[PDB]
């Protein structure tokens, strides 16, 4: 009971300060670590909540890990080490004990409690970070994944994941995690700065000399792009840049050069972006917006657009028997979700202007000969759906599915395609000038009297 906590937490003071102990040996310190190791799983065994409240948690690694693993990764770390192999070596045995000791942790406490969830995670979390230490980034990204998927509210999971994206040099990655990291209920605080400070770098390169761009080539001036409006600097950059990174995600896309996975990290960041310039808010109150918060929200508004046609094209045109499409198809998605969370979306300048973009949707949602689909909540989440969970732009079109079981393809591909013709259905009744669907003999058919912009030949 709360009783017993108290002695378990004011011994377990006892032991925190002795591990500054500038009065304790070289191995009375150890003697002392393992000592509040063994408290602090006591007492997160006993009295989760007692525990949770003073922050045992997070006692528990600072004081008996990290502490340790900085000081070691230091003085193993080349420093003209007397012995650096010694270290190298303690730091290994040590990293693999606290392996030892989370993997037990876990073991012990998860075997509907937000409390028991969150420990849980907390406990993923830092076997993530023990992972990375030892180079295991397999392993470390899978950690912190399963971490994520127990409380997607939670921040840190995510930004967990995009320092390993950094450390491998993933920029589309890495920018996407600081935006999972940054849009939660409960946002890990270092994920803003992280983010700010990564963007910066970015527009400290100059505008790219090619004409024609490879997939890198298209990523770097796409983060530059969210640089320029996140940090608000150099302005003046975004029309011309907008326009060719359109051009180019035309080209690169027909050619098949992203991944489904860009595809929706690339929608993810244009999502972020959008709702932190203006939030769900915006469609109830009537906000005022600086001429620089307008050319920001004119320009990434446009190019989500721009991307949400392009993207509804390249299904239909002109491969793989199937495969042609569904590379485009959840990026579509979800930008078709966040749409049909922003009704006021569609009263937009750049939006009215790009009515062309329907026909292209609508053409595709016919290829999947639609039927009764409006049945409707297969409530299985789909890939990206489990993937995107708790990011704040897109968290009401989940408020059905059921993340629990859930665990391949004609069982999502048939899935999402319904997710889409459901779609299709919601703008034909919200936004009739759009689209609108003759549902007759219980099969549906979508048109619009908006003709099909047909450029020039080639």
Same mark, same amino acid.
């Given at each position: 009971?709360?009783?017993?906590?108290?002695?378990?937490?004011?011994?377990? @003071?006892?032991?925190?300060?002795?591990? #500054?102990?500038?009065?304790?040996?070289?191995?009375?310190?150890? #003697?002392?670590?393992?000592?509040?190791?063994?408290?602090?799983?006591?007492?997160?065994?006993?009295d989760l909540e007692y525990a949770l409240d003073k922050?045992?948690?997070?006692?528990?690694?600072?004081?008996?890990f990290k502490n340790q693993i900085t000081t070691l990764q230091g003085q193993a770390k080349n420093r003209a080490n007397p012995n650096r192999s010694e270290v190298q070596a303690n730091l290994s045995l040590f990293l693999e004990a606290a392996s030892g000791f989370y993997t037990q942790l876990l073991q012990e406490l998860c075997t509907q409690s937000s409390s028991c969830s969150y420990i849980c995670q907390h406990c993923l979390v830092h076997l993530g970070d023990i992972a990375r230490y030892r180079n295991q980034t397999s392993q470390a990204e899978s950690y912190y994944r399963h971490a994520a998927q127990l409380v997607p509210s939670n921040g840190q999971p995510y930004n967990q994941?995009?320092?390993?994206?950094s450390s491998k040099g993933d920029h589309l990655t890495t920018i996407f995690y600081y935006c999972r990291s940054i849009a939660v209920k409960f946002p890990f605080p270092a994920a803003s700065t992280n983010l700010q400070k990564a963007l910066s770098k970015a527009l400290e390169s100059r505008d790219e000399v090619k004409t024609k761009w490879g997939v890198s080539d298209f990523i770097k001036a796409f983060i530059k792009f969210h640089g320029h409006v996140y940090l608000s600097k150099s302005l003046e950059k975004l029309s011309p840049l907008r326009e060719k990174l359109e051009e180019q995600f035309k080209e690169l896309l027909f050619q098949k050069a992203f991944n489904s996975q860009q595809l929706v990290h690339v929608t993810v960041i244009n999502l972020f972006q959008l709702h932190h310039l203006r939030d769900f808010s915006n469609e109830t109150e009537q906000h005022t917006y600086s001429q620089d918060e307008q050319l920001c929200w004119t320009q990434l508004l446009a190019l989500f657009m721009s991307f949400l046609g392009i993207l509804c094209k390249c299904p239909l045109q002109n491969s793989q028997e199937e495969s042609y499409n569904a590379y485009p198809l959840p990026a579509v998605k979800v930008s078709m979700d966040w749409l049909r969370l922003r009704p006021r979306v569609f009263q937009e300048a750049v939006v009215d202007e790009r009515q062309y973009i329907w026909p292209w949707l609508i053409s595709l949602l016919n290829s999947f000969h639609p039927h009764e689909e409006?049945?409707?909540?297969?409530?299985?989440?789909?890939? /990206? @759906?489990? /993937?995107?969970?708790?990011?704040?732009?897109?968290?009401?079109?989940?408020?059905?599915?059921?993340?629990s079981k859930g665990h391949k393809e004609g069982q999502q591909r048939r899935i999402r395609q319904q997710r889409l013709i459901s779609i299709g259905k919601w703008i034909a009744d919200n936004q009739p000038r759009l689209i609108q669907c003759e549902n007759e003999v219980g099969k549906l058919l979508f048109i619009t009297e908006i003709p099909e912009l047909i450029l020039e030949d080639p």
């Open positions: 009971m709360s009783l017993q906590s108290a002695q378990y937490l004011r011994q377990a @003071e006892v032991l925190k300060a002795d591990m #500054t102990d500038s009065k304790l040996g070289p191995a009375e310190v150890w #003697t002392s670590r393992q000592a509040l190791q063994d408290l602090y799983q006591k007492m997160l065994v006993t922050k045992v948690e997070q006692d528990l690694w600072n004081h008996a994941l995009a320092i390993l994206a409006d049945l409707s909540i297969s409530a299985t989440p789909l890939p /990206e @759906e489990f /993937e995107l969970q708790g990011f704040l732009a897109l968290r009401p079109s989940f408020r059905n599915l059921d993340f």
